[PDB]
């Protein structure tokens, strides 16, 4: 991709100052005239199998359009250097939405928000993409309006010892089938992402969106670890303090155990109108 | 208290040549050799220049936000405070290049992890002396200023030629716990299976760490899962199994053949998987095998630097 081949006219675009790091690469502000986000990236792997993927999935995203998911617009790659280039979103990440004290949540506007999330997610799962990374802090609020970012992103194999550092707020996100693989020495893309994976990142959204904060207190990930893929944890946040029993529900369901009987986000769609 | 003079005459010679180095800044230091590096930062062998002495640096590397990195080295400045014959010699702790440095006595054997890769087995007569530092050094904590360490294991136990015992890297700071330290986990775990499940744990989440790295000392080998029947005579699993044994198993135990019932029933009750049930630090320090080690006759120094090779 030599970013000409994209539906997107492109003349020029400029990099702007960043706007945070990850273990993927550096995301900056940008200029097309319109503000985007420019991810760098950079490939050790080289074994052109690693750029075929790339390949595949940059070209699989330019068939996506959808108003509840980032708008992808281009990708180019001059080995080992890559840049993804998504449509800036302006307003602010709903993780620190339901984080603020001014912000007035309600059994209305949760119910309205995860229905456009499910509309998003519904979408990029009818395509056969999984996001393999939904949380709090890759959806974002303007006003009435919801953008999921940062999906597929993890099926790549770029620049990231025998130890893990994984962060809080991304564990409480993780299903059981994914932390019981976490160990040093295997890579995030081996892990078990999937469906319904996805539907149980939006099990700890919800949540999110009903008590403002994690499921679990910041403590030893080792801790968090054995308590995900246990199962217990989520069993004892459901006894601990409940919500609602059509709210506590759709949680229940989505944090399920057994990723089999986790619904799908078509149904969820359905569960999230029957409600107050 | 109860600090022998021996102790509080080696404590008055560290505060004092302390106050003699004053305060300091990066480029005051210069290498020597790789120490080692793990779950956050590495430490290396480092000669202050001002004030001619050879201290150990432990940099860490955290870009965040300014605001809690000064609430952590203003945390981390507690460390003047404590000052204990079993915590190693506290110097100072600084800021620079957005890279926090603790400066810390030198210990010259290392830690009991790597003792314990050259020596392969630590022997009981000792393992006695080193049990007894570590009470002295988790009730000095406890008591005088009410915290708890939360990662007793062998490489973090430091041995010198002088013959002492001190404990380094326990979590006086709450923010650079929750800040960074939590995000990591190692190939092993020597947690309590009572913090594993994320309810409120103690000191007696120490008692069961410190419980497991002695017998993982004492045998040679990281306990859990318990060796195999053709492994014991001679003497691959990933961390969510070796948690999950943690919780759902029974504990290790030391063979009945090698060591004293004191010595079993010591680690026994250190390994109680009930907090409740478990040995408090007022209970182990009279248990019978701390009496027998106490009063026995060991030269540690001379253990050590025969095993390692050091003068
Ligand atoms: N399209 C976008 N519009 C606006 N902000 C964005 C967009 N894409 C990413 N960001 C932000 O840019 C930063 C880079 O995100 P990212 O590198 O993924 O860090 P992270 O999600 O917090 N942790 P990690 O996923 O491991 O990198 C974050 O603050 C994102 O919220
Ligand atoms: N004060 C010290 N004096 C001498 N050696 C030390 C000192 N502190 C640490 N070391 C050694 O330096 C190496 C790395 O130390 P450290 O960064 O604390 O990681 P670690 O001790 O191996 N395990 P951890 O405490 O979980 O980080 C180990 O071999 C330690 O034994
Ligand atoms: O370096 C540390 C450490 C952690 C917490 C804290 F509050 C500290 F002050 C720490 N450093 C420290 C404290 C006292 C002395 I005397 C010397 C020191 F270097 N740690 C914890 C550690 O042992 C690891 C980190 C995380 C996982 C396992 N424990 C390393
Ligand atoms: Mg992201
Ligand atoms: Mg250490």
């Known amino acids: 991709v030599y970013l000409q081949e994209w539906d997107i006219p492109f003349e020029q675009v400029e990099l702007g100052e960043p706007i945070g790091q990850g273990r993927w690469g550096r995301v900056h502000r940008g200029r097309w005239h319109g503000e985007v986000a420019i991810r760098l990236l950079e490939m050790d792997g080289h074994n052109q199998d690693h750029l075929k993927l790339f390949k595949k999935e940059v070209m699989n995203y330019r068939q996506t359009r959808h108003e509840n998911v980032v708008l992808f617009m281009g990708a180019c790659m001059n080995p080992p250097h890559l840049a993804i280039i998504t449509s800036f979103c302006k307003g602010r990440t709903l993780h620190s939405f339901v984080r603020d004290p001014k912000t007035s949540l309600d059994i209305n506007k949760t119910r309205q928000i995860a229905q456009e999330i499910i509309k998003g997610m519904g979408y990029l799962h009818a395509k056969g993409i999984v996001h393999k990374d939904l949380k709090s802090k890759n959806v974002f609020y303007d006003n009435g309006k919801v953008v999921i970012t940062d999906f597929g992103l993890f099926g790549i194999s770029g620049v990231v010892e025998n130890q893990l550092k994984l962060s809080h707020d991304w564990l409480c996100y993780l299903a059981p089938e994914i932390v019981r693989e976490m160990t040093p020495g295997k890579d995030e893309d081996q892990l078990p992402f999937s469906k319904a994976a996805d539907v149980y990142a939006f099990g700890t959204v919800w949540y999110e969106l009903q008590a403002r904060d994690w499921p679990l207190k910041n403590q030893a990930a080792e801790a968090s670890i054995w308590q995900i893929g246990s199962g217990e944890g989520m069993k004892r946040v459901l006894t601990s303090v409940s919500l609602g029993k059509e709210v506590s529900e759709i949680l229940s369901a989505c944090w399920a155990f057994d990723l089999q009987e986790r619904p799908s986000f078509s149904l969820l769609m359905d569960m999230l109108e029957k409600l107050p | ?311």
């Open chain 2, 1 to 311: 208290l109860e600090l022998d003079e021996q102790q509080r005459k080696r404590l008055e010679a560290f505060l004092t040549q302390k106050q003699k180095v004053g305060e300091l800044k990066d480029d005051d230091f210069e290498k020597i050799s790789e120490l080692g590096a793990g779950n956050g930062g590495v430490v290396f062998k480092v000669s202050h220049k001002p004030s001619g002495l050879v201290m150990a640096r432990k940099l860490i590397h955290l870009e965040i936000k300014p605001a809690i990195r000064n609430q952590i080295i203003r945390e981390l400045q507690v460390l003047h405070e404590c000052n204990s014959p079993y915590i190693v010699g506290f110097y100072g702790a600084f800021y620079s290049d957005g890279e926090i440095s603790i400066c810390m006595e030198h210990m010259d054997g290392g830690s009991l992890d790597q003792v314990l890769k050259k020596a392969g087995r630590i022997p009981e007569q000792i393992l006695g002396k080193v049990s007894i530092a570590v009470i002295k050094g988790l009730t000095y904590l406890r008591e005088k200023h009410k915290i708890m360490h939360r990662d007793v294991k062998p490489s973090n136990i430091l041995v010198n030629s002088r013959g002492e015992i001190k404990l380094c890297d326990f979590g006086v700071s709450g923010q650079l716990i929750d800040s960074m330290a939590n995000s990591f986990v190692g190939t092993r775990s020597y947690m309590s299976p009572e913090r594993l499940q994320g309810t409120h744990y103690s000191v007696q989440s120490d008692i069961w760490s410190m419980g497991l790295s002695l017998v993982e000392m004492a045998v040679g080998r990281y306990p859990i899962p318990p060796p195999d029947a053709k492994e014991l005579e001679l003497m691959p699993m990933a961390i969510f199994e070796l948690l999950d044994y943690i919780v759902n198993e029974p504990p290790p135990k030391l063979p009945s053949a090698v060591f004293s019932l004191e010595f079993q029933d010591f680690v026994n009750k250190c390994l109680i998987k009930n907090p409740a049930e478990r040995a408090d630090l007022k209970q182990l320090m009279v248990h019978a095998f701390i009496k027998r080690s106490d009063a026995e006759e060991v030269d540690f120094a001379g253990w050590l630097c025969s095993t390692i090779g050091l003068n």
